[PDB]
Structure formats: C-alpha cells, structure tokens
C-alpha cells in the first residue's frame, strides 16, 4: 500500500494553530515552511511524477480584523490552481523514497506569469495537495493526498506578527 506522510508536522502545527500565512508576490515567493513529504510503498523500479496544487479550502475572502482572521459573506466559485511539477520528475520510485520529497522551489504568485510560478488569490485560504502519478507504464495511476496541517491564507504581507516571528525563528 502507498503511504504518504508529512515531514516536520510538529512545526507546521505551530503555524496552523496561529492561522498560517504565505506571501505571494508578482514574481513569486517560495514557501516557508517547505512542504516535505515522506513516501513509501512505491514500486522502486516504476516511474512517477510528483505534482503539487493548492485547493481553495472555502469560497470566501478572508480579512484580518482586530487581531483575528474572519471570513467574508460574499462567496464566489474559486478553484482550481495550476499544478506544479516537482523538478525531480519523472523519476523512479527508489528516488522518491530515499529522502523526503521537498517542494522547496515552488513559487507562489498573485499575477499570471510566464510559467513555473503558481498563481493564488490573495486573502483566500488554501490546502496543499499532492498527486503521485505513475507514468510511462501500461497502467497509469494517480494517488492524491491533501495536507490539512499545511493550510494557509495567501497574503501580500504578513498580518499576524506571531506568524512573522515564527517564520524568522525557524528559518535559516
């Protein structure tokens, strides 16, 4: 059976209890923390690609109002975000299982851009999700997995200073 776990969930949970925020820019901003996934149960000799997208967790716009995030009252249809392909793709299962798969190069933006960058809507809440695609073989297959621990609100600048502090405290 294919198993997908979140690496460093302890740390993500610290961000989630504060309501996590991720910066978007016109040119694209990398995430902190980085999504790192532990995978086991792949066929070591089969070929896979690792894909990442961001599900809009609700249809609302969020606002930081007097020290707390609150959702608006005018929902709109949202999804889907584009998909980011992990740069190691395509690769053998053994490659993906030898170390946590780390999405350290995805860039979050708020502008339609030349490619690579993933456009999100500022002030919307998102749930990262991966797709593990078995490629090249006879039987294509997709296994998907979301990571509720890694939910965040996309922002152009940090609103909650407790998030700002945690981001610095645990980055290098």
Curated annotation (Swiss-Prot):
Tissue: Detected in testis, but not in other, normal tissues. Detected in lung tumors (at protein level).
DNA-binding annotation, residue ranges on this chain: 11-172
Protein's cellular compartments: Nucleus
Coiled-coil spans in chain: none
Effect of residue 116 to C: In NTD; uncertain significance
Function per UniProt: Involved in the transcriptional regulation of genes required for mesoderm formation and differentiation. Binds to a palindromic T site 5'-TTCACACCTAGGTGTGAA-3' DNA sequence and activates gene transcription when bound to such a site.
Pathology noted in the entry: Neural tube defects: Congenital malformations of the central nervous system and adjacent structures related to defective neural tube closure during the first trimester of pregnancy. Failure of neural tube closure can occur at any level of the embryonic axis. Common NTD forms include anencephaly, myelomeningocele and spina bifida, which result from the failure of fusion in the cranial and spinal region of the neural tube. NTDs have a multifactorial etiology encompassing both genetic and environmental components.
Quaternary organization: Monomer.
UniProt-recorded name of the protein: T-box transcription factor T
Species this chain originates from: Homo sapiens
Gene name of the record: TBXT
Parent-record interval covered: 41 to 212 of 435
């Amino acid at each position: 059976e294919l198993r997908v776990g979140l690496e460093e969930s302890e740390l993500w949970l610290r961000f989630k209890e504060l309501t996590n925020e991720m910066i978007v820019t016109k040119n694209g901003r990398r995430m902190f923390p980085v999504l790192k996934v532990n995978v086991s149960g792949l066929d070591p000799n089969a070929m896979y690609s690792f894909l990442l997208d961001f599900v809009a967790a609700d249809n609302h716009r969020w606002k930081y109002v007097n020290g707390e995030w609150v959702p608006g009252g005018k929902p709109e249809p949202q999804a889907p975000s584009c998909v980011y392909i992990h740069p190691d793709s395509p690769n053998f299962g053994a490659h993906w299982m030898k170390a946590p798969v780390s999405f350290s190069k995805v860039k979050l933006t708020n502008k339609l851009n030349g490619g690579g960058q993933i456009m999100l809507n500022s002030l919307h809440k998102y749930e990262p999700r991966i797709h593990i695609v078995r490629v090249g073989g006879p039987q294509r297959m997709i296994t998907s997995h979301c990571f509720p621990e890694t939910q965040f609100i996309a922002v152009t600048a940090y609103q909650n200073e407790e998030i700002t502090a945690l981001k610095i405290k645990y980055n290098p």
